[PDB]
Symmetry: C2
Subunit: 105 residues, 2 copies
Protein backbone atom coordinates (compact mmCIF):
# COMPACT_ATOMS: atom_id res chain seq x y z
CA UNK A 1 0.00 0.00 0.00
CA UNK A 2 2.94 0.41 0.94
CA UNK A 3 1.52 -1.45 3.95
CA UNK A 4 2.25 -5.15 4.57
CA UNK A 5 0.69 -7.28 1.84
CA UNK A 6 1.34 -10.09 -0.61
CA UNK A 7 3.17 -9.43 -3.90
CA UNK A 8 4.29 -11.65 -6.80
CA UNK A 9 7.68 -13.40 -6.70
CA UNK A 10 8.72 -15.18 -9.87
CA UNK A 11 11.23 -17.88 -9.05
CA UNK A 12 13.33 -19.30 -11.89
CA UNK A 13 15.16 -22.42 -10.67
CA UNK A 14 17.64 -22.06 -13.56
CA UNK A 15 18.81 -18.78 -12.04
CA UNK A 16 19.70 -20.27 -8.66
CA UNK A 17 21.62 -23.21 -10.09
CA UNK A 18 18.93 -25.85 -9.58
CA UNK A 19 17.90 -26.35 -13.20
CA UNK A 20 20.11 -29.41 -13.54
CA UNK A 21 17.97 -31.39 -11.09
CA UNK A 22 14.48 -29.85 -11.07
CA UNK A 23 12.48 -31.09 -14.07
CA UNK A 24 9.18 -29.32 -13.33
CA UNK A 25 8.31 -26.61 -12.62
CA UNK A 26 11.33 -24.68 -13.90
CA UNK A 27 9.67 -21.41 -12.90
CA UNK A 28 6.79 -20.72 -10.51
CA UNK A 29 5.12 -17.84 -8.68
CA UNK A 30 6.15 -18.22 -5.05
CA UNK A 31 4.82 -14.80 -4.04
CA UNK A 32 6.28 -12.77 -1.16
CA UNK A 33 5.26 -10.49 1.68
CA UNK A 34 6.42 -6.88 1.76
CA UNK A 35 5.32 -3.56 3.22
CA UNK A 36 5.36 -1.66 6.48
CA UNK A 37 3.70 -2.85 9.68
CA UNK A 38 2.22 0.22 11.36
CA UNK A 39 2.31 0.94 15.08
CA UNK A 40 0.05 -0.18 16.55
CA UNK A 41 -0.76 -3.06 14.17
CA UNK A 42 -4.41 -3.14 13.13
CA UNK A 43 -6.48 -6.33 12.96
CA UNK A 44 -6.21 -6.32 9.14
CA UNK A 45 -2.57 -7.38 9.46
CA UNK A 46 -3.55 -10.34 11.65
CA UNK A 47 -0.95 -9.74 14.35
CA UNK A 48 -0.28 -12.17 17.18
CA UNK A 49 -0.87 -10.84 20.68
CA UNK A 50 2.90 -10.46 20.94
CA UNK A 51 3.11 -8.49 17.69
CA UNK A 52 0.33 -6.17 18.79
CA UNK A 53 1.96 -5.50 22.16
CA UNK A 54 5.38 -4.92 20.61
CA UNK A 55 3.87 -2.46 18.13
CA UNK A 56 2.00 -0.57 20.85
CA UNK A 57 5.17 -0.38 22.94
CA UNK A 58 7.02 1.01 19.92
CA UNK A 59 4.51 3.85 19.70
CA UNK A 60 5.38 4.87 23.27
CA UNK A 61 9.07 3.94 22.80
CA UNK A 62 10.02 4.35 19.12
CA UNK A 63 13.81 4.15 19.55
CA UNK A 64 14.22 1.00 21.66
CA UNK A 65 11.59 -1.26 20.08
CA UNK A 66 11.84 -2.60 16.50
CA UNK A 67 8.77 -2.66 14.23
CA UNK A 68 6.97 -5.97 13.80
CA UNK A 69 7.70 -7.56 10.44
CA UNK A 70 5.68 -8.40 7.34
CA UNK A 71 6.06 -12.14 6.79
CA UNK A 72 4.20 -15.10 5.30
CA UNK A 73 1.51 -16.32 7.72
CA UNK A 74 -0.07 -18.95 5.43
CA UNK A 75 1.74 -21.02 2.82
CA UNK A 76 0.79 -23.80 0.43
CA UNK A 77 2.56 -26.67 -1.29
CA UNK A 78 3.59 -27.34 -4.86
CA UNK A 79 4.41 -30.64 -6.55
CA UNK A 80 7.91 -30.86 -8.02
CA UNK A 81 9.32 -33.44 -10.42
CA UNK A 82 13.08 -33.83 -10.01
CA UNK A 83 16.17 -36.02 -10.33
CA UNK A 84 17.79 -37.15 -7.08
CA UNK A 85 21.50 -37.72 -6.44
CA UNK A 86 21.22 -41.11 -8.19
CA UNK A 87 19.29 -39.69 -11.17
CA UNK A 88 16.11 -41.37 -9.97
CA UNK A 89 12.99 -39.48 -10.95
CA UNK A 90 11.11 -38.26 -7.87
CA UNK A 91 7.67 -36.64 -7.62
CA UNK A 92 7.13 -34.86 -4.32
CA UNK A 93 4.82 -32.34 -2.70
CA UNK A 94 6.99 -29.63 -1.15
CA UNK A 95 5.38 -27.74 1.75
CA UNK A 96 5.62 -23.99 2.35
CA UNK A 97 6.49 -23.11 -1.25
CA UNK A 98 3.84 -20.48 -2.06
CA UNK A 99 2.87 -17.53 0.10
CA UNK A 100 -0.93 -17.36 0.49
CA UNK A 101 -1.23 -14.86 3.30
CA UNK A 102 0.88 -12.14 4.91
CA UNK A 103 0.79 -10.55 8.34
CA UNK A 104 2.78 -8.59 10.90
CA UNK A 105 4.69 -10.72 13.41
Amino acid sequence: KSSCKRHPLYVDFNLIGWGSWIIYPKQYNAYRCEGECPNPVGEEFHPTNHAYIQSLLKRYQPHRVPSTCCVPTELSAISMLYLDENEKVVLKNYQDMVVEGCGCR
Copy 2:
Protein backbone atom coordinates in the same frame (compact mmCIF):
# COMPACT_ATOMS: atom_id res chain seq x y z
CA LYS B 1 25.10 -11.81 16.61
CA SER B 2 23.96 -9.45 14.93
CA SER B 3 22.25 -12.41 13.22
CA CYS B 4 18.57 -13.25 13.82
CA LYS B 5 18.04 -14.34 17.42
CA ARG B 6 15.89 -13.84 20.50
CA HIS B 7 16.45 -10.83 22.80
CA PRO B 8 14.71 -9.56 25.96
CA LEU B 9 11.68 -7.24 25.71
CA TYR B 10 10.43 -5.80 28.96
CA VAL B 11 6.79 -4.82 28.61
CA ASP B 12 5.31 -2.45 31.19
CA PHE B 13 1.52 -2.35 30.79
CA ASN B 14 1.43 0.97 32.68
CA LEU B 15 3.42 2.54 29.85
CA ILE B 16 0.94 1.59 27.13
CA GLY B 17 -2.12 2.78 29.03
CA TRP B 18 -3.36 -0.63 30.16
CA GLY B 19 -2.49 -0.39 33.85
CA SER B 20 -6.03 0.62 34.74
CA TRP B 21 -7.40 -2.79 33.76
CA ILE B 22 -4.55 -5.31 34.00
CA ILE B 23 -4.04 -6.38 37.63
CA TYR B 24 -1.25 -8.91 37.09
CA PRO B 25 1.32 -9.02 35.68
CA LYS B 26 1.99 -5.28 35.42
CA GLN B 27 5.31 -5.98 33.73
CA TYR B 28 6.61 -9.10 32.00
CA ASN B 29 9.41 -10.25 29.70
CA ALA B 30 7.78 -10.80 26.32
CA TYR B 31 11.09 -11.15 24.48
CA ARG B 32 11.54 -10.25 20.81
CA CYS B 33 13.30 -11.39 17.66
CA GLU B 34 15.91 -9.19 16.00
CA GLY B 35 18.93 -9.56 13.74
CA GLU B 36 19.80 -10.05 10.11
CA CYS B 37 18.74 -13.05 8.04
CA PRO B 38 21.66 -13.91 5.77
CA ASN B 39 21.36 -14.94 2.12
CA PRO B 40 21.04 -17.81 1.74
CA VAL B 41 19.45 -18.62 5.11
CA GLY B 42 21.21 -21.45 6.94
CA GLU B 43 19.38 -24.27 8.73
CA GLU B 44 20.17 -22.64 12.12
CA PHE B 45 17.58 -19.96 11.35
CA HIS B 46 14.93 -22.60 10.67
CA PRO B 47 13.69 -21.12 7.42
CA THR B 48 10.62 -22.38 5.58
CA ASN B 49 11.20 -23.71 2.09
CA HIS B 50 9.83 -20.40 0.83
CA ALA B 51 12.21 -18.38 3.00
CA TYR B 52 15.19 -20.40 1.82
CA ILE B 53 14.26 -19.98 -1.84
CA GLN B 54 13.64 -16.26 -1.47
CA SER B 55 17.02 -15.83 0.23
CA LEU B 56 18.84 -17.80 -2.46
CA LEU B 57 17.12 -15.74 -5.16
CA LYS B 58 18.24 -12.57 -3.37
CA ARG B 59 21.86 -13.72 -3.62
CA TYR B 60 21.52 -13.90 -7.41
CA GLN B 61 19.21 -10.84 -7.52
CA PRO B 62 20.02 -8.55 -4.56
CA HIS B 63 18.10 -5.47 -5.77
CA ARG B 64 14.68 -6.95 -6.63
CA VAL B 65 14.24 -9.42 -3.77
CA PRO B 66 13.80 -8.37 -0.11
CA SER B 67 15.63 -10.24 2.68
CA THR B 68 13.63 -12.76 4.69
CA CYS B 69 12.73 -11.45 8.12
CA CYS B 70 13.60 -12.37 11.70
CA VAL B 71 10.31 -13.10 13.46
CA PRO B 72 8.91 -15.18 16.31
CA THR B 73 8.44 -18.80 15.20
CA GLU B 74 7.39 -20.24 18.58
CA LEU B 75 5.41 -18.42 21.27
CA SER B 76 3.98 -19.32 24.65
CA ALA B 77 1.12 -18.13 26.83
CA ILE B 78 0.92 -16.17 30.05
CA SER B 79 -1.90 -15.96 32.57
CA MET B 80 -3.28 -12.46 33.15
CA LEU B 81 -5.57 -11.24 35.92
CA TYR B 82 -7.64 -8.25 34.81
CA LEU B 83 -10.82 -6.19 35.17
CA ASP B 84 -13.27 -6.35 32.26
CA GLU B 85 -15.53 -3.55 31.02
CA ASN B 86 -17.94 -4.30 33.89
CA GLU B 87 -15.17 -4.43 36.52
CA LYS B 88 -15.52 -8.19 36.79
CA VAL B 89 -12.29 -9.91 37.73
CA VAL B 90 -11.13 -12.24 34.94
CA LEU B 91 -8.28 -14.77 34.94
CA LYS B 92 -7.28 -15.83 31.45
CA ASN B 93 -4.46 -17.58 29.62
CA TYR B 94 -3.42 -15.33 26.73
CA GLN B 95 -1.75 -17.14 23.81
CA ASP B 96 1.25 -15.88 21.85
CA MET B 97 2.49 -13.53 24.58
CA VAL B 98 6.11 -14.65 24.98
CA VAL B 99 8.59 -15.28 22.19
CA GLU B 100 10.31 -18.66 22.68
CA GLY B 101 11.95 -19.09 19.30
CA CYS B 102 13.02 -16.92 16.37
CA GLY B 103 13.63 -17.70 12.72
CA CYS B 104 13.87 -16.23 9.24
CA ARG B 105 10.60 -16.21 7.30
